[PDB]
Structure formats: C-alpha cells, structure tokens
Amino acid sequence: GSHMQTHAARMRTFMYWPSSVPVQPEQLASAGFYYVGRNDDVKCFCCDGGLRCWESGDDPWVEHAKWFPRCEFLIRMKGQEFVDEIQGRYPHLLEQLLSTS
Ligand SMILES: [Zn+2]
C-alpha cells in the first residue's frame, strides 16, 4: 500500500523499452511492467528487486521471476504457482554470495 501507482506513475511506466514494446504488453500488465512497473527499467511496485533484460521473445514473467527476491504483488497466483514451477527449473534461484565479507 504505497502511492507510487497513482499521480502519473501509471503512465510513467507505460512508456517503453527500445522505442515501443513489441512484446505482450497485456501480459506485462500482469507481470509488473508496462504501467504496472516503475519508470524506465520497470522496477515493479511491491517487488524489492525487479529489472528487465528481454532475451529472445521471452515472457515478462520468467524475467520477472528470476531476479525478484520478493514481489508480494505477484506472490499471489504467480508466487504460489509460477515460482513453484519456475523454481523447479531454477535451482540457483535463491541468494548465492556476492561481496559477503
Ligand atoms: Zn514484481
């Protein structure tokens, strides 16, 4: 429950990635991108860790299920079904190490 989804924000993410979104923007709106993401590098709303990296006609969802450490927004039908499946495929989903001293 934050107000980063009002004021203009909604259309502040509805912009684009190259110069228009030739992906599936109706699915993006469910994945937390395009209007439903945040700014340019569609960060998402509830997500603590959303980004974009669009590979080869990939879904917004596998992208937005491989870097999110949490997306309470999307933890609903995706986070109990998606990831339950996606994590089946991703045994390196969880946090590894980085600069942990
Ligand atoms: Zn998210």
Each domain of the chain, given as residue ranges in start order, spans 1-101
Q: Which residue numbers belong to the known binding site?
A: 44, 47, 64, 71
Ligand 1 centroid–CA 61 distance in Å is 9
Ligand 1 centroid–CA 100 distance in Å is 25
3-class secondary-structure state, position 56: coil
CA angle 73, 41, 46 (to 5 degrees): 15
Contacts 24+ apart (CB under 8 A), 4-8: 4/38, 4/45, 5/45
For residue 57, give every residue at least 6 positions away whose Cβ sits within 8 Å of its Cβ, in sequence order, or none. Answer: 23
Backbone phi, psi, residue 85, to 5°: -95, -50
Which option is the CATH number for 1-101: 3.30.230.10, 1.10.1170.10, 3.10.20.30, 3.40.50.261? 1.10.1170.10
Q: Are 53 and 42 in contact (CB under 8 A)?
A: no
